[PDB]
């Protein structure tokens, strides 16, 4: 669906703007962490590309990524907000309803990206694995990973990316 | 207004370890990276690495990949730096620097920390008395030896600050005792020697020593 | 690694005149992103670094426009249009394209002037110090330029080595000269076993080496 492609374009640009604004990001900022390899196990027509919008302050990055995702979702027709709990369950093993999604994605991000296995991961080059992705035949679903330069920040990006690629099914 | 406070000088025995530090002020700590540069005595600068204070990420020069360990403290805005297994060459000054917003330029430097032994002591002041041979009524040289003090600095004025022309106060040197030593000298007319009094004022603030030595002809 | 070569190493500069310093690199410094990450810094004598130019040409806040930078790729140039006495110092170039960040070896800028030979004076230990049980002999070479001088201690015509420290002042803001102080250090006992103490000085503006000396218990 084109609800997909134009919504990920909206959210990939809300991310970018908010990181610049709230975290003083730039594409001319030497990243601490670098997205190395990018791997789709079962790829049925998706391209993932990485975009560098790095910055020092990783909690600024987490809140900026929360703000973008709050908005983008709240900017959904109630009919298409209806489909979001199903993506939650399929990607994060979490149960939710439309009125609950914001607090529940919220509470998952800071549990998961404040955990010690994320915050204390200081390995420079980090890869991203997604299980599956489908695109329209002649229309590749084009996704963008926004590398924030931190491990705490990419953790929130990747979770969005997990929900998104599950939407393509 | 950005400000970088560093810890004072150190003297370690070969094979040991030292920890410099770097309190910060004036900017949102977590928003800027912190570097560390060392400068050997009479040598050029050398980059050691940096730290992100929001996260802990570090990136060392390989020359010290096993010996440096940059560290932070989001509460006290303080970035540490521990060099282990100190050799003789590791003796140098150590500055910490703040980055711009791209982690590509050094926008603010610290002040220095000479790592290379004694405790806090005040100096003995010794008269360097002018020569008897001199030269008629031409120019004569006298001075002060401000010997065996720690830490730095000391200030020296001449004649309660009224004597400025011809004063040379030399930079300190570290002696093998762990104490600094310093000379201060003024050249004056040979004629004024028996006519004018020359008192060198030495103020070493850490010990609150305050000595005023008259330097009288031979 | 990236090796930065600065040239020249020393630059006597007439007050108010131009001046140029050069920086070369062992690899190009133009980054993929378009910028060239070359920078210049000033170090005032014994002070800490002080920002100057970044990314080849832009100046930090509060930086006089007399300073100016240029170049491209792998050979860069810094230029002070008129050299005030406050610009004396060592200038360093740095790069940050290639981790690790690396600096050149520096260039010393000093005001130029005509050669001046030093005035020499020796100072035997003071009685007071000799009470304390140690003996310092001090030699003052005053107002000299160029900065390059040699000081030699001789105890009873015996060249000393390893027992003496020196220290030099900054170039003088008014007459542009240097001064140096060498300090011979001996135990009181060792001071007493020898009679003649001489300080011997070598420097361009002297046509033959100068010696100032004294005999224990005389001057």
In eight-state DSSP terms, residue B14 is T
Which residue ranges form the domains of chain B, and what is each CATH number?
A: 3-109 (2.60.40.10), 124-214 (2.60.40.10)
Is residue C13 located within the same domain as residue C99?
A: yes
Mutation to test the A interface, candidates B54, B62, B79, B101, most A Cβ within 10 Å: B54
Please name the residues in contact with A76: beta carbons below 8 A apart, sequence gap of 6 or more. A7, A84
Q: Which of A28, A32, A59 sits opposite B57 (nearest CB)?
A: A32
Please name the residues in contact with B185: beta carbons below 8 A apart, sequence gap of 6 or more. B128, B141, B142, B143, B144, B167, B168, B169, B170, C140, C142, C179, C181
Is residue C45 located within the same domain as residue C123?
A: no
Mutation to test the B interface, candidates C30, C44, C48, most B Cβ within 10 Å: C48
Read off the tokens for A94: 């979490």
Cis omega (within 30 of 0) for bond into C77: no
This structure's resolution (Å) is: 2.8
Inter-chain contact C142–B171, Cβ cutoff 8 Å? no
Whole-angstrom Cα Rg for chain C: 23
Locate the chain C residue with the closest alpha carbon to A26.
C33
Separation in Å, CA of A31 to nearest CA in chain C: 12
Whether the CA torsion B3, B8, B9, B11 is positive or negative: it is negative
Is residue C82 located within the same domain as residue C178?
A: no
Q: Is B175 helix (H, G, I), strand (E, B) or coil?
A: coil
Read off the tokens for B161: 């600050």
H or E segment to which residue C182 belongs: strand C178-187
Residue that the structure tokens 């679903």 belong to: A141
Whether the CA torsion B34, B40, B42, B47 is positive or negative: it is negative
- Kindly report the length of chain C: 219
C158-181 in b/e form (b: 16+ CB < 10 A) is eebeeebbebbbebbeeebbbbbb
> Into how many domains does chain C fold?
2
Please name the residues in contact with A128: beta carbons below 8 A apart, sequence gap of 6 or more. A35, A37, A38, A39, A48, A145, A154, A158, A161
Q: Is A72 helix (H, G, I), strand (E, B) or coil?
A: helix
Mutation to test the A interface, candidates B56, B102, B104, most A Cβ within 10 Å: B102
Is residue C69 located within the same domain as residue C166?
A: no
Whether the CA torsion B28, B32, B33, B37 is positive or negative: it is negative
Q: Cα separation of B87 and C148, whole Å?
A: 31
Is residue C63 located within the same domain as residue C124?
A: no
Locate the chain A residue with the closest alpha carbon to C36.
A28
Is residue C10 located within the same domain as residue C74?
A: yes
Is residue C106 located within the same domain as residue C12?
A: yes
Is residue C32 located within the same domain as residue C89?
A: yes
Residue that the structure tokens 């001090």 belong to: C138
- Chain B hits for C100, CB-CB cut-off 8 Å, are 47, 49, 61-62
Whole-angstrom Cα Rg for chain A: 15
User: Which residue from C50, A59, A53, A57 is spatially nearest to B32, judged by alpha carbons?
Assistant: A57
Experimental technique used to determine this entry: X-ray
Q: Is B100 helix (H, G, I), strand (E, B) or coil?
A: coil
Q: How far apart are the first and last CA of chain A?
A: 10
* DSSP string for B123-136: PEEEEEPPPSS--T
Chains in contact with C via at least 3 Cβ–Cβ pairs below 8 Å:
A, B
- Chain A hits for B58, CB-CB cut-off 8 Å, are 122
In eight-state DSSP terms, residue A106 is H
- Chain B hits for A26, CB-CB cut-off 8 Å, are 101-102
Domain with C191 in it? 119-215
Separation in Å, CA of B74 to nearest CA in chain C: 26
CATH number at residue C49: 2.60.40.10
Residue that the structure tokens 């330069």 belong to: A149
């Amino acid at each position: 669906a084109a609800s997909i492609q134009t919504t990920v374009n909206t959210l990939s640009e809300r991310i970018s703007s908010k990181l610049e604004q709230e975290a003083n990001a730039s594409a001319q900022t030497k990243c601490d962490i670098e997205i190395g390899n990018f791997y789709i196990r079962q790829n049925h027509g998706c391209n993932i590309t990485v975009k560098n919008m790095c910055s020092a302050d990783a909690d600024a990055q987490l809140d900026a990524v929360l703000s973008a995702a709050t908005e983008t979702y709240s900017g959904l027709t109630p009919e298409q907000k209806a489909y979001v709990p199903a993506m939650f369950t399929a990607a994060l093993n979490i149960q939710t309803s439309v009125n609950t999604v914001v607090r529940d994605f919220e509470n998952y991000v800071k549990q998961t990206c404040n955990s010690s296995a994320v915050v204390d991961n200081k390995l420079k080059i980090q890869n991203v694995i997604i299980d599956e992705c489908y695109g329209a035949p002649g229309s590749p679903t084009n996704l963008e990973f926004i590398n924030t330069g931190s491990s705490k920040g990419n953790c929130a990006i990747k979770a969005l990316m997990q929900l998104t690629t599950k939407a393509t099914t | 207004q950005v400000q970088l406070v560093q810890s004072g000088a150190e003297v370690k025995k070969p094979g040991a370890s030292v920890k410099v530090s770097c309190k910060a002020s004036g900017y949102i700590f977590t928003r800027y990276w912190m570097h560390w540069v060392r400068q050997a005595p009479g040598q050029g600068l050398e980059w050691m690495g940096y730290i992100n204070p929001s996260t802990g990420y570090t990136e060392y020069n390989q020359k010290f990949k096993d010996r440096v360990t940059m560290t932070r403290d989001t509460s006290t805005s303080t970035v540490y730096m521990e060099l282990s297994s100190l050799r003789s060459e590791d003796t140098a000054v150590y500055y910490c620097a703040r980055s711009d917003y791209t982690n590509y330029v050094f926008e603010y430097w610290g002040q220095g920390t000479l790592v290379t032994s004694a405790s806090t002591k005040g100096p003995s002041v010794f008269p360097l008395a002018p020569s008897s041979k001199s030269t008629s009524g031409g120019t004569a040289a006298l001075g002060c030896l401000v010997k065996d003090y720690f830490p730095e600095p000391v200030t020296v004025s001449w004649n309660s600050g009224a004597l400025t022309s011809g004063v040379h106060t030399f930079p300190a040197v570290l002696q093998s005792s762990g104490l600094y030593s310093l000379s201060s000298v003024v050249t004056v007319p040979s004629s004024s020697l028996g006519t004018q009094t020359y008192i060198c004022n030495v103020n070493h603030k850490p010990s609150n020593t305050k000595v005023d030595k008259r330097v009288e002809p031979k | 690694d990236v090796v930065m070569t600065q040239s020249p190493l020393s630059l006597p500069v007439t007050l108010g005149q131009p001046a140029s310093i050069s920086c070369r690199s062992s690899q190009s410094l133009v980054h993929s992103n378009g910028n060239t990450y070359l920078h210049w810094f000033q170090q005032r004598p014994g002070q800490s670094p002080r920002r100057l130019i970044y990314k080849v040409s832009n100046r930090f806040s509060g930086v006089p426009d007399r300073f100016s930078g240029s170049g491209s790729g792998t050979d860069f140039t810094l230029k002070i249009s008129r050299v005030e006495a406050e610009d004396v110092g060592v200038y360093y170039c740095s790069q940050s394209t290639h981790v690790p960040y690396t600096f050149g070896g520096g260039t010393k800028v000093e005001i130029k002037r005509t050669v001046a030979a030093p005035s020499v004076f020796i100072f035997p230990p003071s009685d007071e110090q000799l009470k304390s049980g140690t003996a310092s002999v001090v030699c003052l070479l005053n107002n000299f330029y160029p900065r390059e001088a040699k000081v030699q201690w001789k105890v009873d015509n015996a060249l000393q080595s390893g027992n003496s420290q020196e220290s030099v002042t900054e170039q003088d803001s008014k007459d542009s000269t240097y001064s140096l102080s060498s300090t011979l250090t001996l135990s009181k006992a060792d001071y007493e076993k020898h009679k003649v103490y001489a300080c011997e000085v070598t420097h361009q503006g002297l046509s033959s080496p100068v010696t100032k000396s004294f005999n224990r218990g005389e001057c």
